[PDB]
Design a protein around this ligand. Sequence first.
Ligand SMILES: Nc1nc2c(ncn2[C@@H]2O[C@@H]3COP(=O)(O)O[C@H]4[C@@H](O)[C@H](n5cnc6c(=O)[nH]c(N)nc65)O[C@@H]4COP(=O)(O)O[C@H]3[C@H]2O)c(=O)[nH]1
Ligand SMILES: Nc1nc2c(ncn2[C@@H]2O[C@@H]3COP(=O)(O)O[C@H]4[C@@H](O)[C@H](n5cnc6c(=O)[nH]c(N)nc65)O[C@@H]4COP(=O)(O)O[C@H]3[C@H]2O)c(=O)[nH]1
Ligand SMILES: Cc1cc2nc3c(=O)[nH]c(=O)nc-3n(C[C@H](O)[C@H](O)[C@H](O)COP(=O)(O)O)c2cc1C
Ligand SMILES: Cc1cc2nc3c(=O)[nH]c(=O)nc-3n(C[C@H](O)[C@H](O)[C@H](O)COP(=O)(O)O)c2cc1C
Ligand SMILES: [Mn+2]
Ligand SMILES: [Mn+2]
Ligand SMILES: [Mn+2]
Ligand SMILES: [Mn+2]
Lengths: 394, 393
Amino acid sequence: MLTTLIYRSQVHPDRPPVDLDALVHRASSKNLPLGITGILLFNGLQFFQVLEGTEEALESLFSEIQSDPRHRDVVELMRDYSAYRRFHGTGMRILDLRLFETDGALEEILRFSTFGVTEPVNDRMFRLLSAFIADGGRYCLPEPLQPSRWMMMAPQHLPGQPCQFALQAIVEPAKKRVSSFEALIRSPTGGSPVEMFAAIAAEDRYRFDLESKAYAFALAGQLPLGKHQLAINLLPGSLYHHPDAVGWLMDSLLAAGLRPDQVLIEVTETEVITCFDQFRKVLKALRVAGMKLAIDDFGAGYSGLSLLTRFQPDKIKVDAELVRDIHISGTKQAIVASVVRCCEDLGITVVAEGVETLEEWCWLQSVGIRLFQGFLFSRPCLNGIGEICWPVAR
Amino acid sequence: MLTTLIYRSQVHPDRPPVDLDALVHRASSKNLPLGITGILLFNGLQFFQVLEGTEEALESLFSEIQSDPRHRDVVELMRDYSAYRRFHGTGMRILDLRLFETDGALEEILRFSTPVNDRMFRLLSAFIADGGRYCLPEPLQPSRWMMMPATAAPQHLPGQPCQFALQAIVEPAKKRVSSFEALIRSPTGGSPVEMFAAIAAEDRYRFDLESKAYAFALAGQLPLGKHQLAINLLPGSLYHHPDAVGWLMDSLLAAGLRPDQVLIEVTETEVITCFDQFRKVLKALRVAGMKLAIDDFGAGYSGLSLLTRFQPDKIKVDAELVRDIHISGTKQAIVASVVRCCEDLGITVVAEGVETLEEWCWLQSVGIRLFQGFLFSRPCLNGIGEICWPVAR
Ligand SMILES: Nc1nc2c(ncn2[C@@H]2O[C@@H]3COP(=O)(O)O[C@H]4[C@@H](O)[C@H](n5cnc6c(=O)[nH]c(N)nc65)O[C@@H]4COP(=O)(O)O[C@H]3[C@H]2O)c(=O)[nH]1
Ligand SMILES: Nc1nc2c(ncn2[C@@H]2O[C@@H]3COP(=O)(O)O[C@H]4[C@@H](O)[C@H](n5cnc6c(=O)[nH]c(N)nc65)O[C@@H]4COP(=O)(O)O[C@H]3[C@H]2O)c(=O)[nH]1
Ligand SMILES: Cc1cc2nc3c(=O)[nH]c(=O)nc-3n(C[C@H](O)[C@H](O)[C@H](O)COP(=O)(O)O)c2cc1C
Ligand SMILES: Cc1cc2nc3c(=O)[nH]c(=O)nc-3n(C[C@H](O)[C@H](O)[C@H](O)COP(=O)(O)O)c2cc1C
Ligand SMILES: [Mn+2]
Ligand SMILES: [Mn+2]
Ligand SMILES: [Mn+2]
Ligand SMILES: [Mn+2]
């Protein structure tokens, strides 16, 4: 089946310049028998290639290209079935963009290409081409954020309690500062939140969820929360199904020696979205009392900026699924960069969660994320503050 | 009940400078007896004001401020319930940011306030760092523009079980119609709801799909030329038959159109209930060469979910985000972000429901270039209606 593949990459600036002549000649000769057409753009630091051919042929080729030592940071932008070829001839065509002025490059692209009967700008491929030509250095990974330049550098269990909590740090690696801590519920045998809640009768889960937070506040009180925020997770129903859950929480945290503003409530958008009605008065009560609110797993399930017109949380936590393989996904890159900017304009704190590799950290940092939660830095620590690991140069 | 209100505004650059000393002292003296406190930041071109007090009190005051001729382009950034007063003991006070070095204004603020975990503080900081970001440029001021019409020939087409009205989608910078959207009408010219109500519930999917032959027939004999035709379809109308896509192909080709000329609008709400089923339709549409738009994007609480799982050719920004965008910092921020994301993904963005020049100007300022709305072109039954264009003064 006819398929289109588009990707972008960068050269190693410390190595000798890539022989574009050899590249394009061998590409051209290899592509024609395989029925591969397309175009390659080069701006001095970055490549941009459009490839058209069968799914199989492009799957084989792209694997070779991904492993090629002539370039790095290969980011896939589009991969789709196609009704017709935009590019004709063949060699692989190549434009050295350093030789073109303003719109000369688009003019040469339009010489031999066909984008159907409607204006070229109605074709996604052409829009991607024009964006690379206009500002291709936008998602060029900076030199200080190359992954290879970095490397990474006690408490008891409490079985007698009905539940216990693990604390995980949210960190700002750029300042080597812990930003806040999230409390994560654990069963009396050290089990996950899913096992904890399976052990509770269905009619008691909401009440358990709210009332377990007493143990989280007690822990946070016994630890030196030195002006650090504590995040807690709650089902919206746990706050809603109570005469005064907000007031209950208030008495609990103040009794533990915390302050309202020190406590942030984390709810997932999937659970928020499905009940605006009852969340508005809960959020209102939480606001007036002085507690904060985060949207957790933003990007997972149903996730929206339109959520923000109704109300604005204090913090958004970008779900691990947008973080996962962000280094190779032009889509995830664009989406996360957009969330970051929107939150800046709205005054909403943004945290990237599930950060497991330096690659993820570097690319998230390149799109404006400064706060991070993940196993790369700190794992959850049962009834205590864990060790934090910091990235350090080389 | 305590509340916080934040807005940013702009000076008139061509008028004599406002005596802010007098303004602020008068403000402070009036505010404090009413239980109102806050601060005013000024950078030479823009104001940023934080107000604190009862919902009633700030409602009343902000209404006076919105109508004050000393400024314009008043955009509200925040209005929320508050637990405590951040500016206790200050009726009003001005900080001229041009009188401080970096960090200096924020350091002063924190000496009479009563921090980066607070949203008001983050918004203050953002104004001090890059307040000019959503400053409406001078050539995009609504008073610098006027609409003028570029004759409509609608017709009744008998013998058909439905009709279609056409509304243009326009690119005003190039004074160009980008595409036409086909909007279904009853045999008597009534609304889509009126059309579908006359059809039996179990046959509505089939009718929705088969009605498109009449949209294609209309576009074909116009002639459509090099323009796109947007048609609206329920995802379920596409699943109903084995070769719904194959049928659409036949019908548009018989009407003399090309696959890449036809674009299918599905509403985000209808896609996100069923990710399954749609993948197989979408595959067939792509292989056939037809294009896809997400309609009313931002009305089902929206898309970040969707874009990883596919990317449409076009997104149409919902009319709710367009409405009052000229006074909503939140809506401006959201639309600006969608525009940037789509640009990066090579997705075409259209703003829907554009009714006023105020909306068009602000939409233009956040990067939108395609527009659909009564400001430019109203739907015309079985024909191409008249189109109005903004022209500069
Ligand atoms: N793969 C990966 N995972 C990472 C990484 N960093 C952190 N995590 C984990 O992601 C979960 C915390 O985020 P969450 O979205 O609040 O997700 C939590 C939260 O929703 C929740 N939960 C925790 N405590 C409570 C609670 O007290 N009440 C309610 N209703 N839910 C809770 O159950 C969910 C799953 O929690 P956990 O098993 O504790 O697992 C934790 C955590 O250990 C990473 O780098 N990679
Ligand atoms: N206030 C205001 N309204 C504006 C403005 N500009 C356009 N509109 C209107 O917004 C609707 C078109 O957008 P839609 O989201 O596709 O919304 C459409 C679409 O969902 C739909 N529809 C139309 N044709 C079909 C169809 O053939 N099949 C299906 N399933 N739905 C259809 O029914 C909806 C109602 O359509 P319409 O009555 O034709 O109303 C039209 C239109 O006249 C504006 O500036 N201000
Ligand atoms: C930016 C870039 C674009 C490339 N494009 C192609 C191409 O389109 N066709 C191709 O066969 N190889 C292309 N390659 C080269 C492949 O990565 C790989 O070196 C080559 O296909 C191996 O073929 P060989 O067996 O002849 O050595 C490209 C490499 C880079 C750096
Ligand atoms: C940037 C700006 C900020 C203002 N802030 C206040 C204020 O906080 N309190 C207030 O009473 N008026 C404020 N005003 C002035 C009002 O718009 C209005 O002129 C005044 O309150 C009318 O009441 P008065 O005639 O009793 O003074 C502000 C005006 C501008 C342009
Ligand atoms: Mn959480
Ligand atoms: Mn989470
Ligand atoms: Mn539509
Ligand atoms: Mn719409």
